[PDB]
Design a protein around this nucleic acid. Sequence first.
RNA 1: GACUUAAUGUCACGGUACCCAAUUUUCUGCCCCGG
Lengths: 652, 1242
Amino acid sequence: TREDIDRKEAERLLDEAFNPRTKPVDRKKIINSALKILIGLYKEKKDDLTSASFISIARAYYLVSITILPKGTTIPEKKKEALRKGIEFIDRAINKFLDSQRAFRIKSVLSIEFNRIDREKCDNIKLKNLLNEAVDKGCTDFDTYEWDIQIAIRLCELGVDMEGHFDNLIKSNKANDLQKAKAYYFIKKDDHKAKEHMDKCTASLKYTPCSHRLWDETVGFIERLKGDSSTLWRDFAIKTYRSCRVQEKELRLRWYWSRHRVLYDMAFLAVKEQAVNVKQAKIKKLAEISDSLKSRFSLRLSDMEKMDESNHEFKKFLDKCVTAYQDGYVLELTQVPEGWVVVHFYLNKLEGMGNAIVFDKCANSWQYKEFQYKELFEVFLTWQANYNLYKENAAEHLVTLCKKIGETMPFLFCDNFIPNGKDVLFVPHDFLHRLPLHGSIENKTNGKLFLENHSCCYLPAWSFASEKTSDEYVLLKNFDQGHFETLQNNQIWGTQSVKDGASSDDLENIRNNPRLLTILCHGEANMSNPFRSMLKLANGGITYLEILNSVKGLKGSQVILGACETDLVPPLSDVMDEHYSVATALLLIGAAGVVGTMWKVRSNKTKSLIEWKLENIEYKLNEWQKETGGAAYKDHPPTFYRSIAFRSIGFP
Amino acid sequence: MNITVELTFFEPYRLVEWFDWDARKKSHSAMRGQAFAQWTWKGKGRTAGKSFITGTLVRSAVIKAVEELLSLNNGKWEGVPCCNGSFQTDESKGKKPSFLRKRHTLQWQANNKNICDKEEACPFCILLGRFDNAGKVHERNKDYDIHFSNFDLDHDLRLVDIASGRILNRVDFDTGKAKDYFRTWEADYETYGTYTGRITLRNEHAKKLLLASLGFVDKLCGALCRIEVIDHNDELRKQAEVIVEAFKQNDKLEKIRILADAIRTLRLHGEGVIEKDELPDGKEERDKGHHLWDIKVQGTALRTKLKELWQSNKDIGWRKFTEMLGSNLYLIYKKETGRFRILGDTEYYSSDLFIPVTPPEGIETKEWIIVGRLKAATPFYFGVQQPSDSIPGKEKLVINEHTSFNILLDKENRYRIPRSALRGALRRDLRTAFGSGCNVSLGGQILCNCKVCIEMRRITLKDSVSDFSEPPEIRYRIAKNPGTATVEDGSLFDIEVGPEGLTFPFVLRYRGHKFPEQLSSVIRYWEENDGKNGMAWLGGLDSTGKGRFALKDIKIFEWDLNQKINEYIKERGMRGKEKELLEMGESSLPDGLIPYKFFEERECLFPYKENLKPQWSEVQYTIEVGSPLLTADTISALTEPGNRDAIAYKKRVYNDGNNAIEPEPRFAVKSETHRGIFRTAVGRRTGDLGKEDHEDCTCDMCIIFGNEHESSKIRFEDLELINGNEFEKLEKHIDHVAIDRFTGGALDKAKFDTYPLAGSPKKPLKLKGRFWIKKGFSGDHKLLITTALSDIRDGLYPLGSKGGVGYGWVAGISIDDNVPDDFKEMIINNDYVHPGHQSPKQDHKNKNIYYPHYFLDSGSKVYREKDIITHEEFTEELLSGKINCKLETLTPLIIPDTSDENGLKLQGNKPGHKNYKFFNINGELMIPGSELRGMLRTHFEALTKSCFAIFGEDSTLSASKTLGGKLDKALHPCTGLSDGLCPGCHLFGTTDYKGRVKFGFAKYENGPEWLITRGNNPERSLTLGVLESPRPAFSIPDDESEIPGRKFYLHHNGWRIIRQKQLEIRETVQPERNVTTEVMDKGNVFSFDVRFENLREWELGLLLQSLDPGKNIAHKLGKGKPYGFGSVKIKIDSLHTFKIKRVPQSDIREYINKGYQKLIEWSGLPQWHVIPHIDKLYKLLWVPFLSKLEPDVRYPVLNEESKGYIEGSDYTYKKLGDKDNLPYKTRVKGLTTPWSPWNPFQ
RNA sequence: GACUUAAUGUCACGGUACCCAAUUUUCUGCCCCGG
Ligand SMILES: [Mg+2]
Ligand SMILES: [Zn+2]
Ligand SMILES: [Zn+2]
Ligand SMILES: [Zn+2]
Ligand SMILES: [Zn+2]
């Protein structure tokens, strides 16, 4: 009839959309046309539509949900909505009469996707019952259909005995290496062959981008393995972290997938559980796992789509990641200068602990201490909430936060963890980036500041450390008139200095690697895109991306930012602080170090920093803060508030 | 003791279905509404119930108020210090509270002398219930030192009586589209706004703090708050089903949509339109009556069925009856008809931290209240879902999206600006002002510390409602098909809009320590002043310029909450008295309120100047339409009593001065027509208009004009007519008619009248409109908009309807001075000669008598080309341009202005005599572009052997079959596009395809003006001989003769006889049978423009050949062609081709030659007589006397006893009608032979 | 009273029903011989 001709055209369109060679942007149009034919044919036929056409719509709606990538951290409701629509479309084929076999294949595969993105609307009990119903209806045919492998192996994770179907599952060449590994682990309960096949899975994961469906299931498998208390998860999580580290190298761009953090949390927790020189090499590995996580920041797909040499590389990466999403369904750590100490912070979420990985360059010693960050995070949130309302008047809430950093991290003031005279490079993690660790006060009476003993530097990650200039001082000011008028008239400011109304082009115009660049402008933060957070310069301002692509004359330059980090990065509504400041972009474009306030501070103190920095630029920042009221948090918390704001972001 | 507390609401408060704490987690709507008023179902029917506010919610509000009160006074109330209280429970120690606080707790320095406990406690710890016998599990009310009962509604009550379900939104800031939506119940605060509850307080120590906090609670359940211590629908649906079925039996089910729109529009005309029978009746030429109001429903006309339906439903009122009948009709139509959407919108709802916020000691906390008026600067829209979909408790696989959209009103039908929409617009504009804001996360356990969210937490708005409550106007929109430039079927959709100039009460309350520079910037951005437009974009359809509101009468008063907190609490912050705050003066202010003298001006506000002011650029310009503009309101023509087929669009405007809708509606081009002209203008030059789909589309048209994923960066407002007072008659009646190709006469059913705005070249219509360009336009997209604007100026896009016959032709545009400087900075003869005919040339002294008309018996071969030329782009190989043509009259020309049947004013002395003036607009003489087009089309259809586009097929003979069966099948009018289009229908268009030539009105230029005839009562006039209906029986005498072909009329000076016969035409012929008309003279010059686009090389050449065929070939135009009137010569003054170059004569001749070859290609210095049908055509249009040749051409008289008959001629129809004198075949052969003599018949 | 709260913790004023669509395309107010 005319229905079969239209359904066959819809089927041949769905087959084209199911072709992995189809582009994702073209696949969505194809399913649109196939669903245009199928829905319109369903509109006329209504309930009298044949079951093969209802399987066709369910197949089309399964493909629809494949093209709906998560635009944020949460799984989209359109994706749920599309699988929900396919399930009630396939229910019309289940309830009205090989066809039932093809109907249950797509019903169960839709339900597997629905279960993993919506555990409440399709829980494991309901999924298990319908997965079994497909199995007893002949949906165990793994040789020609890759979906029955997913049906059976999903039942393996559900605890259903599939010993009878194991032999044909392994024999089938359509089964994935991870799927073969899951079959060995769940059915045969043998760990040697599950190791062999997972290793072939993770070896292949070095080439599949992290948006691929296989990345989520591999990490989900290790989560199952960790929750099963098996010994396989420790070796597996490290091995797939290594594949992630390899895949990350292919702008500090990282695709956001939910299981990425738990992968690093699992890999960190695996190496921590394995931690003479072997123990130390494990702690070294902890800092490399932590550094690999902070080396890049995940960008949400909506921000990736809402983004010019970088435009090409972004479009290559965004297209590659989006394609691989839908394809699944169809500097050395010890190169620190002598006399320094590097504290790598890692906040595990899988466990409640934060971990401080310190490296003493003199001792060549790796040691780590765990701390509780939950109570500290609330004290930071109290400070952040109070600062965002009262600014300087929240200096009392800064003192308790600084007292909390010294109480939650007593090892900062322990000589074994961090020696006395050593310069400390802080590589914090998540909300510890917003923590004035230099301003921490040890949990003791008349506790001294951390900066009174150690010259503190900061890094978003160890991978931002550089190796390295003129004698010119450049002032790029786009600030309000009331502030820095006296600082303008300083004679030391060079001819490249745009001392009033400086623009984005003015920052790009710098070419001679000035000894000190002083940008006094306002900061504004894109709350979702670190790349779009900008320094409020003239002619529209200059973003993080524009600094990356357009500023080339700051090689080894010391940068003083008049914009507070609170302006540059958004406030934290979660433990994560994956937002790179505009100072991170300045580090990537070769600046030796960026000095700026961590929070809003009256411009007199910022100017007092710059004039102090104008002479003897190699001055240590902590020596200034000790003599400018940093040591006085009991007496004048406002004066402790202003000096603790200044931190150095960079590394020689 | 027991305190009885009255809880009253001053705006619609939110209601939620009550679920117990355990059962509440299962529903996302109820967890969303834990802070709302609760609805229990009080029955087994789920229709009637009880509303109530839990005492836990009142207690939460009161505890929040106590925190703020004690933070204002640094932790004490009336001198007794309070500790910080407790707001953290250990899970190990005990069970957690049913509600966990996510917000920041206001804390102070606890200056209480002793730590609070069971024995002694501060008033705060008493009010919290920290140290009484009552705990997380309720046992009995005696354990509660402070107790809050459930606050019951004071008024069984049905849910639909109290609450109305409304879908709310979360619009993405960057795209302008809604991320998701969520439903809510908005309960009616005017009828069900008072809730009574008992607050028992055993500890007197906290009495003063409790009463103060009761006076301080500002909001509850989503509404402003004062806490005081003290079925015709089903029958109309069945009848609408009856009407829809009756339309289906008529095969007019598509007319049910316009019938629903018309019946809904009837609510603006009162019940008198249906009882006094004021609905239009259609023309008297059609015995079927009106095409809509005379459709038989159950054997009676729809106009009387509507009268019976109204008589049955008089009780519910006229507006409700028309609204619900039209709604039922629309819903049935949507059900039967079933653009295609695969997925619907997402209905989305929705870490234990104590965050102590300690405000600085001595910080001044004030409450600034901004009272003003929100004036609708443009027609506004606040989208509400369909009422059948929004029934609370009954809220509604195939995504059948709604096509008709309603505006948001309250129960009294007053327009409301909801607090949710005003708040969303304010958040959007504050995010613009700050330059940085969050996308609103919905389940955050941590408060968003973005500057927008920090300030929006202190901002409280109010639900605005207008006193005006007259029905909204329905704005109908169509999607044009890009390829055919016609209406896409089923693409008609409409929204209800509120009138512009409508005014709403604006209340903004800011509770903070300093008034932010950004909120002040947003208020100034929204404010309207001298030389500034209010820029409050509220609601939907901002792209079509809907909902641009202006803040006016802005007064800012600040409460001093540190020293006048008792005056604030006494006045309840004037939370229902803001309309009285706006009216009162400074002297009548309450004690705590002072005027805020510090509101900064616009130029002093950095967020305004750098973020808000440049965000939208106004491009205001005036369109000059020197043409009769007809942007038709198709529904209005169905409801106004004027019996008018096409009337100009006009809109209702509210006047705040008179507090009423202005009695005279303003004519305007709709902002949607304004928007869609630009969108096609941009899309045709970019080629984006021809794209099959726009999904995830980043094309130039999708970037500028948006799509379903991103909102438009350009917003178009209506093009208001600003000249209406200059016209003594704005509305101009113009009659058009289709002429049968064969009979040469008008089809009776094909007559139609338009009612455009009387624009003319001398007196054009000034149309002042504007659009808004968003900040961030690229240079190339800004260049596209100016190119689109220049395309409108050049006349490429006529406004409104009938642009092909010269309507809506833009004479020019005038850019206003305030337009950004960047924006305004980027904005012959035909030598051919026909040999004539042998018979008149060899006739010296003009003895032969010729028939006034002859037929073009061309062959059956019609070249119907299936590769239809698309309208969606300007094809490079095709030709687009404008032909400036000069129209010279060789004989007197008659174009009657048939709107005035008594234009010469001589029916008083000669009753029944049809007298017309020459066609004119605003006094200047014009040839309507329809007349010029229909006379080019008839020529072009004859030249190109096209189909008989206009044919009276149903007309019978006297015989076996009608003329449709008698005409050849290939000669029938081109129907549809599945079969090809003939060259005439390809060039001039069908009803399924817009023609590629537009003909402007021919303005009179120069000449002797009228034909002056002494003895005629008007000297400019000439009483014509009778113009009787053409007789096809003469052309087809027998059942075997076929249709002889296209009737053309000879060029002769037979009008001279008519002019000489003037004194005896009036006396002899009956005044009713004949007409007198103002007559133009020979040598009068008219200038008209032929605008063509996407023309082939040969089609422009054949069109140029059709315009000017030769030295001695001209056209017959207007009335009296058989009497020799209307011989008109067109010569091309200039030809221009776009991509604008003046085409030289050599290139013109190449076009004409290329058209010459296409004609011989279908046949099987060009010489046009070599093709037999063109030679016969050009003989029929050959003009003698242009040479000692004055052929005498006239019709034979009936009998010997007939006037105007010369004895002995034997020319009468008695001789010619007899088959004995001459055979029928030779009569037809002589009828199909141009210029063949008829008195000495050949 | 109960319906119908839970109490040392309710940012839901925490969320613009938003977003896309030209009421238009075609049509000469024309005109002679038989009830
Ligand atoms: Mg208690
Ligand atoms: Zn207390
Ligand atoms: Zn926010
Ligand atoms: Zn597009
Ligand atoms: Zn045709």
